[PDB]
Amino acid sequence: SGSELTAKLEPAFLSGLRCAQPLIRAKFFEVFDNSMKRRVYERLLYVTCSQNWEAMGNHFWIKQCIELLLAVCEKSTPIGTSCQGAMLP
């Protein structure tokens, strides 16, 4: 961690994040998720400032932004809505 090697392998890591094989993509996102704190502002700052997205190539890396920010959301809360007028009673 922090070696020149991890700096040199960034294109490979970004290939893992955009991988078409979901198990690889999940393992790489799990590494990616823990690299920053579970906070909205810090992750928005990450995607604006820290991540060079050039190595993604032609990939629509907004997918990774969605994945990164939605990870902040609370997971154990029961599913629900504000749309009480649309709910089946």
């Binding site: 995607v47 604006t48 400032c49 820290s50 991540q51 060079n52 050039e54």
Partner: protein, 104 residues
């Protein structure tokens, strides 16, 4: 580079690099996401340039002239010129257009 660079072009180049890219004089990366974009710089310069300056030409000019000059500064030359050179450029173009109109 075949037409000479006006002080207004150099000033637009320097200000584009400083204001828009928010990069320092030596283009050292401050944030990894913020790599230099010489296409944007070429677009800014060409808004007021006397001829199309490519992004490669803008990069070469910046690195080979403005970096040594900032290390009279481009701001000092721009202030001292008082738009005279660029005015004389347009005067010359107006004279050539009047010459062409008269030749009809």
């Amino acid at each position: 580079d075949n037409p000479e660079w006006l002080i207004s072009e150099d000033w637009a180049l320097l200000q584009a690099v400083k204001q828009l890219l928010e990069l320092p004089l030596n283009l050292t990366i401050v944030s990894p996401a913020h790599t230099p974009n010489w296409d944007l710089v070429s677009d800014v310069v060409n808004s007021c340039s006397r001829i199309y300056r490519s992004s490669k030409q803008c990069r070469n000019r910046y690195e080979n002239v403005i970096i040594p000059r900032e290390e009279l500064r481009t701001s000092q030359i721009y202030a001292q010129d008082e738009n005279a050179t660029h005015t004389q450029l347009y005067t010359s173009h107006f004279d050539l257009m009047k010459m062409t109109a008269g030749k009809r």
